[PDB]
Design a protein around this ligand. Structure first.
Ligand SMILES: [Cl-]
Ligand SMILES: [Cl-]
Ligand SMILES: [Cl-]
Ligand SMILES: [Cl-]
Ligand SMILES: [Cl-]
Ligand SMILES: [Cl-]
Lengths: 275, 158, 275, 158
C-alpha cells in the first residue's frame, strides 16, 4: 500500500513519495516510524509530490522532517524532486514550475543531469536574520570567550553567520560552532559556516547547522557563504563550493538579483512498503 | 441500462494540445469543474457515444480531433450514499467508464460551449496535466488518477 | 539488477538478499556503499541466502557486516533468515536445516510467528572466553579503579561478562562498560551485560557491546546473562528477558543441554536496486 | 535439427516426491550430477519426447508418474566457447529447453538406472529442493534457477 523512492542530494537523504498517481495518508507518528533508521526506511526528510494547486504550475510538494513536522525551507529537497518527476515519467520538461510552503518557483535540469535552483535574493538586513546589531554592515565583531571573530551575517530564509578561515581542516568547528550558534546576538540561533577562499571562483566550506551540529552539506549554507563572500569583495559572480559531501556551483550577481544554486541529486533505490 | 452490479456505462474524454495541456470545463450553473463524460445509449459503440457527447457538449466533428488512445478496460467508481437514489430501481450505484484521449488538430475556436439548448457546461480553459486530479470531486478522484496515469506517457510525445 | 528485503530483529536491521533465485555478486567496497545510511540502503549487516551445499539441508547463508567482512556469529541473523525464506515462498517448512560459517543448525517457527534458535551449549571454561583466571568459578572479582565488581564470565561463541545490578535504569553503563570491556583479564575484550533479576523467570538487561558501546539488543548477550544467572542459582529454566528494544525468551536446562533463544523478526519493506 | 539461432530443442524433467525432494542423477562414468534432459526428434511433441527420455533413462511408463506442470516458454542457454564445435554445421550454440515436473505416484524401485545398453546415468539419489542450483555446471545454472523457481510453488503443495 505504497511505492516510494530513496534519494539523496549530497548526502541529504529523502524518502520521496508520488502522491500524484497514488492515494496516500500520513501521521506524525507514522512519519516517525518510517524515518527511524533501524526500524523503518531511514531518512532525514520525507518529500511528497502532489498535483498542482493552480492550472499554470506543474506540481506542488511538501516536506516533513523525521520529527513529523512540515518543513518550509527555500531550496530544501528541490533537486531530488526535480530529478524524481522526470525519472518516474510524470513530466518531460526541463523547466518545472513548482509550489511549496514557500511559494512559486522554477527549476531547471541541465544537460549534465544537475538541477539549478533559484533561491531568491539574500537578505542582509539584521532585523530579518534575526541578528542584533546597530546597522547593517559587511562584517561584524563576535566577542566569543577569549577569541574575537569577524563574522558576516545573511539570511537565505535561514539565519547564517559566515566566518573566514585559513584551512577548513584546521578550523575548530566542534568547539567554536556551538558557542557561536547559541550567541546572544542570535535570538533564533544561527547556522555557522567556516569558509576558506581558494580563488575568486573556488572556496571550501564547513557548516555547523542549528541544533544539529556539523553537516556534510547545507545548501542554504553554501548560498550564505558565497553571498557574504561576494558582498565582502572576496569572490567572483560564479563560485564553486566544495562541501564535505561534494560540490555546488553558486551564481549570484549582487543585490537586486536572485541567487542560483546548482547541484546533483542521486536516485538510490525503489521500494514498496505496506502501511 | 444498468448492469447487474449497479454501474451504468459512460465515456470520458480528455482533449489535450501539442503543448501538453488538457481542457477543463466548468459545469453548467455552478462553478465546479470536471471532464466531459456521457451515457452510452442501447446499441451504441464506445467510440460512437464518445463522438456523440463530444459533438453535443463541445461542438466538435470527427474532422477536428485525432484519437490518441482509449483505456484498456472499464473503470468503476461508486457514488456516495447521500447521492444514491434507492427508490428508483434498478438502483444506479455508480459508473463504469471508458476514457478516450483526443488531440485537437483544429483550432481553439470550434469549442462551442453550448451547441444545444441543453448546455451542461458554461465555459472552459486550458490547464496543466495533473491539475484535474486535485480539483475534481473527491469520489471521482481515483478514476482520474488511473486515467491521467495511463494517458501521461502518450501525451508526453511532443 | 537486484531485489532485496529490509528487515530487523529487535532493532538489528538487515538487508536480506535471495541468492537462490538471483544471480548476485559482491565487493567489500560495494557492501560498504550499500550499508551507508544516507548514500545507500542503510543496514548493520547484509544477509545472503544461498542454496544448500549438501543434499540433506535446506539453505546456507552468509553475513557481511557494514565494514565489508564476513561475520560468523552463532545466532546472528537467524530469525530474519527464517521468516524471510517463508515470506518469499522459498520453503513452507517450520523446521529449517541451515548451514553457516559456524556449521549446521535447525530453526523452528512457532505459531506466534516467532523463531526459536538453538545457540549451542554455553562454555564457561575461562581459557575459551578468553578470560584470565586460575580456575573456572561461578563468580569472579573485577578490581576496576576504585570499585569492586562481581562478574560472571561465559562464552556463547562471543566473550561475555555478566554483572548483577539492582535497577538497569540506575546502572552507570556508559562509564563502567568501557573500563570493563578493555580490562586486563579480557585480552580479546568482552561484551558487558548489566542484569537486573525481577523473578526467577524474568530479568531486565542492558549490554555494552565490544568496540560499539551500548546496543538495544544483543542476542548472545541475553543468552550469556541467562546462562550465568542460571549457573548462579538466580534463575529458573525458562527466563523472559527484557532488552531496550523488546523481548526474548531463553530456555536452557543446564550443562549438557543446548540453550534455546526465541524472538521476533520484522519484515519492513521490499526494495529493488541497480548495482 | 537446429533452429536459426543455433539452439537445439530439448526437454528437462524434475521428478519430485510428496516429501518435497527431487531426484538427482549421476552422469555416466563421471561423478558429476544433473537433471534428465533429452532431444526432441523431428515430428515429436514436447510431451512425447519427454516421456521418451523418461522411459529410456529412467524406465518409467506413464502409469508410474503424474504430470504436475511444464514451463510456459522455452528457456535458452549457451554453451561456452571451448565446447563449441564450429566446424560441424549448422553449428549448435546452445539449447532451448521445455521443462516438465512429475510426481512419483509409484515406488522408488521402478527407477531403472540403465534400461538400454546405452545408460547415460550410473546411479541416483533424493536431494532437497534447491540443491541442484548449486551443484549443476555453471553455464546451466540460470536455467536451473528459473526452472526451480517456477516449479517451487507447485511443489510446495504437501
Ligand atoms: Cl512560477
Ligand atoms: Cl522566477
Ligand atoms: Cl450516475
Ligand atoms: Cl541439521
Ligand atoms: Cl540440532
Ligand atoms: Cl548441446
Amino acid at each position: 500500500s505504497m511505492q516510494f523512492s530513496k534519494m539523496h542530494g549530497l548526502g541529504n537523504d529523502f524518502m520521496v513519495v508520488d502522491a500524484v498517481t497514488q492515494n496516500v495518508f500520513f501521521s506524525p507518528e507514522l512519519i516517525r516510524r518510517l524515518a527511524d533508521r533501524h526500524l523503518g526506511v531511514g531518512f532525514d526528510q520525507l518529500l511528497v509530490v502532489e498535483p498542482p494547486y493552480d492550472p499554470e504550475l506543474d506540481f506542488h510538494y511538501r516536506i516533513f522532517n523525521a520529527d513529523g513536522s512540515e518543513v518550509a525551507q527555500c531550496g530544501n529537497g528541490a533537486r531530488c524532486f526535480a530529478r524524481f518527476v522526470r525519472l518516474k515519467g510524470l513530466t518531460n520538461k526541463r523547466d518545472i514550475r513548482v509550489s511549496t510552503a514557500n511559494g512559486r518557483m522554477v527549476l531547471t535540469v541541465t544537460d549534465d543531469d544537475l538541477v539549478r535552483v533559484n533561491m531568491g535574493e539574500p537578505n542582509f538586513e539584521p532585523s530579518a536574520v534575526p541578528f542584533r546589531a546597530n546597522k547593517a554592515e559587511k562584517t561584524y565583531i563576535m566577542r566569543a570567550a577569549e577569541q574575537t571573530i569577524l563574522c558576516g551575517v545573511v539570511s537565505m530564509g535561514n539565519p547564517h553567520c559566515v566566518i573566514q578561515v585559513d584551512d577548513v581542516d584546521t578550523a575548530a568547528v566542534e568547539t567554536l560552532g556551538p558557542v557561536l550558534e547559541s550567541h546572544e546576538r542570535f535570538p533564533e540561533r544561527a547556522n555557522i559556516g567556516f569558509m576558506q577562499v581558494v580563488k575568486r571562483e573556488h572556496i571550501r566550506l564547513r557548516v555547523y547547522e542549528r541544533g544539529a551540529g556539523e553537516t556534510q552539506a547545507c545548501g542554504s549554507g553554501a548560498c550564505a557563504a558565497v553571498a557574504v563572500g561576494i558582498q565582502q569583495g572576496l569572490l567572483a559572480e560564479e563560485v564553486r563550493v566544495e562541501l564535505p559531501g561534494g560540490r555546488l556551483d553558486i551564481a549570484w550577481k549582487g543585490p537586486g538579483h536572485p541567487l542560483y544554486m546548482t547541484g546533483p541529486a542521486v536516485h538510490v533505490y525503489d521500494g514498496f512498503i505496506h502501511l | 441500462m444498468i448492469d447487474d452490479d449497479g454501474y451504468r456505462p459512460n465515456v470520458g474524454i480528455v482533449i489535450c494540445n501539442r503543448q501538453g495541456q488538457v481542457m477543463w470545463a466548468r459545469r453548467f450553473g455552478q462553478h465546479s469543474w470536471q471532464f466531459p463524460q456521457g451515457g452510452i445509449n442501447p446499441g451504441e459503440s464506445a467510440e460512437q457515444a464518445m463522438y456523440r457527447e463530444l459533438f453535443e457538449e463541445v461542438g466538435l466533428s470527427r474532422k477536428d480531433v485525432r484519437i490518441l488512445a482509449s483505456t484498456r478496460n472499464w473503470l468503476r467508481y461508486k457514488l456516495p450514499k447521500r447521492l444514491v437514489r434507492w427508490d428508483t430501481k434498478p438502483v444506479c450505484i455508480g459508473q463504469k467508464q471508458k476514457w478516450f484521449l483526443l488531440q485537437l488538430v483544429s483550432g481553439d475556436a470550434e469549442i462551442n460551449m453550448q451547441t444545444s439548448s441543453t448546455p451542461e457546461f458554461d465555459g472552459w480553459r486550458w490547464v496543466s496535466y495533473w491539475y484535474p486530479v486535485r480539483q475534481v470531486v473527491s469520489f471521482k478522484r481515483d478514476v482520474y488518477r488511473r486515467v491521467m496515469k495511463e494517458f501521461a506517457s502518450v501525451v508526453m510525445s511532443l
